[PDB]
Amino acid sequence: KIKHEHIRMAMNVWAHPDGEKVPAAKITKAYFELGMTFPELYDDSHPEALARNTQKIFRWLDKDTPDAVEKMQALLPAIEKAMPPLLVARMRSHSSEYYREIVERRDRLVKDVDDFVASAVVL
Amino acid sequence: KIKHEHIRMAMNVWAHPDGEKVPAAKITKAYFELGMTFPELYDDSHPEALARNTQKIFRWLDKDTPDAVEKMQALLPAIEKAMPPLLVARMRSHSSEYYREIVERRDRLVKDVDDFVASAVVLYDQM
Amino acid sequence: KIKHEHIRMAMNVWAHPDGEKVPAAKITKAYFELGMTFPELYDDSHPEALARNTQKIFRWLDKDTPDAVEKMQALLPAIEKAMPPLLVARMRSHSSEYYREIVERRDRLVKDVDDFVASAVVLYDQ
Amino acid sequence: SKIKHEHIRMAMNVWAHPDGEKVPAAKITKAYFELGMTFPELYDDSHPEALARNTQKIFRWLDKDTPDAVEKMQALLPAIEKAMPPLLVARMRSHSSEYYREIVERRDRLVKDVDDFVASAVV
Ligand SMILES: [Cl-]
Ligand SMILES: [Cl-]
Numbered sequence: 346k347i348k349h350e351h352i353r354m355a356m357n358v359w360a361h362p363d364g365e366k367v368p369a370a371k372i373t374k375a376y377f378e379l380g381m382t383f384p385e386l387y388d389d390s391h392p393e394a395l396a397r398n399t400q401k402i403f404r405w406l407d408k409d410t411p412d413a414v415e416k417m418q419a420l421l422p423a424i425e426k427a428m429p430p431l432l433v434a435r436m437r438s439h440s441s442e443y444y445r446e447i448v449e450r451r452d453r454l455v456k457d458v459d460d461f462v463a464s465a466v467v468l
Numbered sequence: 469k470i471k472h473e474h475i476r477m478a479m480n481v482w483a484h485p486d487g488e489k490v491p492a493a494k495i496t497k498a499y500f501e502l503g504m505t506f507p508e509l510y511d512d513s514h515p516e517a518l519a520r521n522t523q524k525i526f527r528w529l530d531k532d533t534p535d536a537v538e539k540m541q542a543l544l545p546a547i548e549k550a551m552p553p554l555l556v557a558r559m560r561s562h563s564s565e566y567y568r569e570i571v572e573r574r575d576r577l578v579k580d581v582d583d584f585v586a587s588a589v590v591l592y593d594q595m
Numbered sequence: 596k597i598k599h600e601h602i603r604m605a606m607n608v609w610a611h612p613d614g615e616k617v618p619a620a621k622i623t624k625a626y627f628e629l630g631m632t633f634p635e636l637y638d639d640s641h642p643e644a645l646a647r648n649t650q651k652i653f654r655w656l657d658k659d660t661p662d663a664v665e666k667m668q669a670l671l672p673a674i675e676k677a678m679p680p681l682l683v684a685r686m687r688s689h690s691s692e693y694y695r696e697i698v699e700r701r702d703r704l705v706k707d708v709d710d711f712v713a714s715a716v717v718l719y720d721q
Numbered sequence: 722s723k724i725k726h727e728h729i730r731m732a733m734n735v736w737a738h739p740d741g742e743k744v745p746a747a748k749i750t751k752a753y754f755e756l757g758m759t760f761p762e763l764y765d766d767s768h769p770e771a772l773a774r775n776t777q778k779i780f781r782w783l784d785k786d787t788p789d790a791v792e793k794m795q796a797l798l799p800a801i802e803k804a805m806p807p808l809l810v811a812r813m814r815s816h817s818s819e820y821y822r823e824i825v826e827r828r829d830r831l832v833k834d835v836d837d838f839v840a841s842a843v844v
Binding site: 429430431433434447450451454455458459461462463465466468 | 824
């Protein structure tokens, strides 16, 4: 139900501030916490797990083959546990009316903020 | 700039939670901090100063004579220095489009926040 | 779930602006709307129900006897149905990490909001 | 030249980003004539491709670094400020004015305040 493209969108927004290694690291940590096995991610005994897990995760995210689409679907439990809750909600907003409402409320509030700050501005 | 009638409104909202003695006291504190003398408000050397100041301030607030209006106008420096800044903006909103837009935009943001708190409470009780 | 003393805190803040009769009144409508029997509150047929109900509700809130806690625990469905939602969240925050966090972040945003207004009203002195 | 050319460009590009350059050009042109301005040259209400020609001119200067380009944008500032969204004006000026830096900082904190709040509600 969560379309491959929306995982990709949310994942890129998550990677933009500090790069993919941050999302990759947190996804892996939650992946092992959930005792998962598919898709394959290198545990910490590999000295280059992170660079490898990063390259992997974003190759699948950027491909549109059925194998890659499936692998990201399997990873959803780990992404959701690890993603910032506000970003999970955007990811979910295209398939869940609740979360769509959540982001609309978030968006409404910051528009409230911007209009407010602007009214204070002089010049 | 601030019409007498607008001090009255903001002053009544200020007094409703805890009474008039609270605004009067805060007004007096700023009155003296600002080294004022007109109109006259009693320092602590006069008996029942707060009660007498309170009765004074709010008598001027409810009357509409040029004297009542004049004394309230002299008091503005103390009132605004003493009042919650948000309340000053509400007071000024009837005479300044700047502040009207700010209070109006502030109120919408806070209502929109609190409504969301409401939606979360409902999520529980549903569940 | 809600400890008796925390119902009391929330109840007094509700009573602070306009008195005890206001919350009592809102509680009375919700108790009947919610069809309750314990505790006992006087219907509209008593000409001094509201005052007596007001004294009733707030005796239990101010007492700590085993009886009073039991009566106040039953009234919570009415209190929560009638109380300002923000105040229920404050009330629930003493027992719910969810609400502790929600209320906290709410209070910070609004405090930052009001502070901004303070800085603009000050800069008016220009 | 307190406001560096590069910051007018940054601020101008975000303004143009949602709906294109014609919106900023149009709103800027309106303020230019309202202010009875004459330098740099912007075509009055009467020329043919005025908006498109005005759009290209305004954004040619923004993208050049020559002395004439810098000066024409500096001269245009009074119109840009009358027309630009106030929140962006503060952003544009924040590197040269402590007031606007403070505005922009207070704003960004409020938006994080919001995001923390919605996140806390999301669970
Ligand atoms: Cl709307
Ligand atoms: Cl021509």
